[model samples]
Target: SMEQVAMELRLTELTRLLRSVLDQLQDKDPARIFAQPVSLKEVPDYLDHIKHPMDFATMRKRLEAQGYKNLHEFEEDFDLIIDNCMKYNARDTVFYRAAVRLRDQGGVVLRQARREVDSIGLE
Candidate 1:
């Protein structure tokens, strides 16, 4: 089957690197702002403003649970978390700046991923 073409091989090979990538993002946050669920209880308008809430806790859960079938999917989930921050908060806020900074970090993390993926050699 063509399943071997990408999924299972990359899925197995990239597991540790995937975890490392997640760690890079998590490591940057000292404030624990993105650590937990952005509950609507404290900020009712949070639910109203954000369409899809995302957090490190959920990403960590899904990674271990195998909810992510591939690195690309994981990247999308990560982007959603970043974009949600930008969408809900104004540019004047700290939250907005953190998301922007983390996004740049995401770029380097992903660049690391690209080289390592080739090192893993799909070819």
Candidate 2:
């Protein structure tokens, strides 16, 4: 019963955390989520094309320009967040795949951002 109890407690905590995140999201307009030209329909399309991590790095620049600074930090962060969110949300396959795709894509975006900054000649 200990395992069951632990599982239940974890679920409860995850639910609470999810609710808090949802509440925060709800406080803002959905449009605010799109700091870039990308749309919800485009996410799956983009994920389907994930090959290298740098793809994400490219996306990050767009997101940054759109004003999602933290998400632009790195692809790994997004990957982990999505991975955890999916795992916590009862092993949702869709979320898991999306997270993996985003992670790879983020990698591309991160590399691009670094290159862009380096090009600026900032020591």
Candidate 3:
């Protein structure tokens, strides 16, 4: 049970770090369009185009709710949020271009978070 508390603390720490990364990525969207859920009515084909849709609001709320089982899932969802934008829209559009730039901008900080996490090693 002692190690259980340690793991709990580690996860909470990880979630905070991951959310920090999410915040950075969400902030750079230029239009803040990524902050809200995509309207199915407005973008009728969005669900069809992106099989696994993710959004900033969902991920942030998930973190607050402690919905992620692990750091990898958080990373996967974060990547999904960015990639979905790129996939559903073409490079000619701001959505795709912003997603690309945001990914590049956020990745370095995300890896830094990982670097910090590695040092904690739950053992």
Candidate 4:
């Protein structure tokens, strides 16, 4: 099935990206670290179910409430989530991929913001 193949591809990409981040974090075994079982069967349906719109401001507030002082801190937690999802073979879930995409997009925004701030010449 094309849908299944596409899902596999997404999961593969998520795994690859998660592994890269884990390597950078020096987290050798995320499965051991996260230590939880994810529902493989429920993942596919759950992914389909979460396709609604997101409220960025609300999301940002929630993250801040969780003690993420900056995008870098948020990204570390996001990477941890991705690593856990991949480690548990739950990458097929919409939640997993959504977090991955959010992390990628947020990283871009943060990097650009940092560049702009650096250009301000505020000595």
Candidate 5:
């Protein structure tokens, strides 16, 4: 599916980036001293902290709390969280897929939330 393919490409990019970061860090601190091996298990827990919402109602409540008045505001926050969330873990195929799932769902919820905010603003 297209989702799977997109996730795979994202994972590949993330892996390459992480490897470079690791290489630099290792060069600075050899002997495996400060470097901890990141694994797939860490992805979900890290993502849990940044999840926007699971469904429409929850998304509504979240946006209400945030004082978002339009799609533009929601998108701004969405980009911020997505950017930070994307960096929370090193890449592995399995873990990357999971993160992509969360990101997709979060993005969907954000879009829906935007609709509500816009509608209210129109009134």
Candidate 6:
């Protein structure tokens, strides 16, 4: 338990430091520094290549319905789900698998979503 607590604290500190760095970048020219040029049309095409274990369409819809407008919101909701699973000791259940699957696919989905949103000039 102490180990877990220490690990979590370390992770929290790492995340805080990373966020600080990102905030600093945001204050500068984000487009030139952080933007990865991606075609909006290609995003969906790339998404099609990811063989999702669950229905991503349904997952996306559910996330949208729950007011998850961006990757960060989705990530927070997903982390909450994982935390709940750990709280209830349901690590061996489908819930845990679902969380893992979502996490596995998160980078692809989030990157594409960010590109699409940026392409459209929407926040």
Residue 117 accuracy (lDDT) in model 6: 45
Estimate the Cα RMSD of every predicted model relative to the unseen true structure: 2.9, 16.9, 1.9, 16.3, 17.6, 18.1
1-123: candidate 6 lDDT, tens digit per residue: 998777655545434433433333323322221123223375555334323222223334453343343446544543443344344336787545554554454445545655654565332
Q: In terms of TM-score, which candidate is strongest?
A: 3
Per-prediction TM-score: 0.83, 0.33, 0.86, 0.32, 0.33, 0.35
Candidate order, lDDT descending = 1, 3, 4, 5, 6, 2
Question: In candidate 1, which residue pairs clash?
Answer: none
> Cα lDDT of model 4 overall?
0.44
> Which ranges in model 6 have alpha carbons more than 4 Å from their true place?
1-71
Query: What's the best-to-worst order under TM-score?
Result: 3, 1, 6, 5, 2, 4
Residue by residue across 47-78, what tens digits does model 1's lDDT show? 77777888999998988766776667888888
lDDT of each: 0.80, 0.41, 0.79, 0.44, 0.42, 0.42
| Model 1, global lDDT | 0.80
| Cα lDDT for residue 108, candidate 6 | 54
Candidate 4 segments exceeding 4 Å error: 1-89, 121-123
Cα distance off (Å), candidate 2, residue 71:
9.1
Q: Write the per-residue lDDT of candidate 2 for residues 5-91, one digit (tens) a residue.
A: 776555454344333333333233232331233333745554444433222334445443432323224334344444543443344
Winner by lDDT between candidate 5 and candidate 1: 1
Q: Estimate, for each residue in 6-102, the C-alpha lDDT of model 5 and write its tens digit.
A: 7655545434433333233234322322223232374446445544422223333444453443346435543443344355545664434444555
lDDT of 3 by residue, 1-123 (tens): 998887788778777777777777777776886787788998898887888888888888999887776667888987897889988888899888888887888787777767766776621
